[PDB]
Design a protein around this ligand. Structure first.
Ligand SMILES: NC(=O)c1ccc[n+]([C@@H]2O[C@H](COP(=O)([O-])OP(=O)(O)OC[C@H]3O[C@@H](n4cnc5c(N)ncnc54)[C@H](O)[C@@H]3O)[C@@H](O)[C@H]2O)c1
Ligand SMILES: NC(=O)c1ccc[n+]([C@@H]2O[C@H](COP(=O)([O-])OP(=O)(O)OC[C@H]3O[C@@H](n4cnc5c(N)ncnc54)[C@H](O)[C@@H]3O)[C@@H](O)[C@H]2O)c1
Ligand code: PRO
Ligand code: PRO
Ligand code: NA
Ligand code: NA
Lengths: 344, 344
């Protein structure tokens, strides 16, 4: 028994071989089915994630995210949010890895990058929610925050809605100027637009910013279109929010993970009484979502480990077919199971 | 940047080059100093661990154990307790791995086996406690449970006490009969003896069994020597205990981690106001242990992530000295930190 490790090169090869659209579509499809299974009581929400706050160089958090498929495997994503990483170190803000363990024995069976996988399933989750809650003829996407997540927000949403235009904003001029180049592969025309213009003109919005605790909202509470759907994607520290309270109180709100959203999502701003069914229940019966397409809706996204497990499976399937990755004996399996010193 | 991976081969070469005795002594010494640092308020107990219960093929648990050194790094041990592993799969009951993450960036910097390390630091912790609370001329060790942990319990204790014999019991006849061969290198003569005889004759006892929830005690409530010290090491599911309540109520009880021990240790059986000072406090200020060698004492051991971080440091120091291990690029670090697809 050895651990199957996908290098950064292998993850790159999966993308190049499968194609960006096809890979994202596979993850959207797996996520929509898995969420419906939860909504039907065939699968269960992952446990609350845990985390450790860090104050330097700027406030961030490092988290562990487990999910168990009984009798099959356990998934654990370890992921940091370190918003000074791009400017100070040329590293992504979100940095992580995903491990798979055999549920029967505990053995570490696979390990891979979490950076790309996280961005993919986070875009996919927004596409799942927006397919349910945005107008099917949605033409204009708004993006507040044009960092890493914005790229897969636009990509995934462009696969499920007839987007013709993306109105985008970032507080860092260099980050908003570069977004059109990073988004060019989607074919959707990008325009820089200030938040009040995005609020007024967009059919669907994703907010995905590194805004600090207490420094929201990143979108003003002003004229929004009656049918607006928002994916509230930013999530890290307790006390970080992105949307104005008055907008949230007006909206139909659905969370991906209700207990996580109440602690780390926009639902921090609301009472537990106030929320609708969770995304899994809307996937299982979209009748509850159809009648909210033409009114104000918010998908409160925090990310949960089930999404990472499903995305990892897509990557492992593609990598196995192409004989990608290395095998590394990491765990010590003594020749005598009762002798820790029996190094084989 | 690449992750430093210590393969099972690298861990084997560290212990082969350094030797079991010296490597165990290094971990005993580092654990002693680190515990005293906690007792002096210079460092802090790890947060409570978390886990997922698994019922098949027998009840077990899979846990995550984080410990943060602020500004430096975060350690995470992932470890399963799967008590059917030896008989069913030829695998150790305790199967795990230990990772290190940079606290500033979040990046995965090091990854190694947790099987040997866990056995080493668990023996070491009992040795730290027994130096404080067992008679310094203790001659007879008792072991209830002669599986994997029993090997390093005997080894560690033989380095800090003048042990001449070990009286040992297991409910599996094959496992108690094989213990003498696994223990031979220590030079401590091994004799199989029923638990009542072990209770009557031992100067120090370690209990380290895979007894099921509700099926304790593994040591009977009967006559023991006035000075007996017990390392209660068994720990996994809530409701699993090893010692008889009557014995516990007469003992001076020090826990490695009070909150964890009240949940998962022998202290599950005790009112919280009956606990003695935790082990870290005994290490920083021996006034609390003065005179307790000569009466009944119990070290309630549950294991906590600080111990794994300290033992990992010992391994990484030896591995760095010898340039052992491999570098694997696992995390995707895009050339453009704001572009997850820049598979750069
Ligand atoms: N919900 C999920 O499943 C999930 C998954 C991954 C990341 N996230 C979260 O999404 C957020 C963004 O992550 P990322 O990887 O895109 O980070 P990033 O650092 O790559 O991008 C964040 C961008 O936000 C910009 N920004 C900061 N404050 C702003 C403001 N007030 N208005 C507009 N823009 C602002 C920054 O300039 C930066 O360009 C983080 O909170 C992250 O933790 C959520
Ligand atoms: N305190 C810590 O830090 C720490 C660290 C590692 C493991 N543990 C715990 O120690 C315990 C033993 O772990 P291990 O790795 O030695 O497992 P193991 O499976 O190698 O050995 C356990 C032994 O206990 C025996 N046993 C079961 N019920 C018994 C009973 N009533 N009386 C006597 N023997 C009995 C089994 O036959 C087996 O040989 C587990 O609960 C484990 O989770 C604690
Ligand atoms: O779900 C995730 O992976 C990210 C991590 C930070 C915020 N949510
Ligand atoms: O501290 C530890 O590693 C072990 C794991 C199971 C029981 N406690
Ligand atoms: Na959110
Ligand atoms: Na215990």
């Amino acid at each position: 028994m050895e651990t199957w490790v996908l290098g950064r090169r292998d993850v790159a090869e999966v993308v190049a071989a499968v194609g960006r659209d096809e890979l994202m579509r596979r993850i959207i499809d797996r996520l929509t089915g898995g969420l419906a299974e939860i909504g039907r009581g065939e699968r269960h929400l992952s446990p609350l994630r845990g985390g450790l706050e860090r104050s330097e160089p700027v406030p961030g958090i490092w988290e562990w995210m487990p999910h168990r498929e009984p009798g099959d495997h356990i998934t654990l994503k370890t992921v940091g949010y370190s918003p000074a990483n791009p400017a100070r170190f040329g590293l992504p803000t979100i940095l992580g890895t995903v491990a798979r363990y055999d549920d029967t024995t505990g053995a570490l069976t696979a390990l891979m990058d979490g950076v790309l996988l996280t961005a993919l399933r986070t875009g996919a989750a927004s596409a799942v929610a927006s397919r349910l809650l945005a107008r099917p003829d949605s033409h204009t996407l708004g993006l507040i925050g044009t960092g890493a997540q914005a790229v897969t927000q636009l990509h995934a949403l462009s696969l499920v809605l007839p987007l013709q235009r993306a109105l985008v904003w970032d507080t860092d001029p260099a980050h908003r100027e570069s977004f059109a180049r990073r988004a060019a592969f989607t074919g959707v025309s990008v325009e820089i637009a200030e938040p009040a213009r995005i609020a007024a003109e967009a059919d669907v919005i994703s907010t995905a910013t590194s805004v600090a605790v207490g420094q929201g909202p990143v979108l003003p509470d002003t004229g929004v279109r009656e049918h607006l759907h928002i994916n509230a994607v930013g999530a890290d520290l307790v006390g970080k929010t992105e949307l104005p309270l008055g907008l949230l109180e007006r909206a139909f709100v659905t969370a991906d993970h209700p207990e996580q959203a109440l602690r780390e999502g926009e639902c921090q701003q609301l009472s537990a009484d106030r929320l609708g069914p969770q995304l899994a229940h809307l996937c299982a019966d979209p009748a509850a979502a159809a009648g909210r397409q033409d009114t104000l809706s918010v998908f409160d996204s925090t990310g949960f480990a089930f999404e990472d497990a499903l995305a990892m499976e897509v990557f492992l399937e593609a990598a196995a077919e192409r004989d990608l990755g290395i095998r590394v004996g990491i765990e010590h399996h003594p020749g005598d199971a009762l002798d820790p010193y029996a190094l084989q």
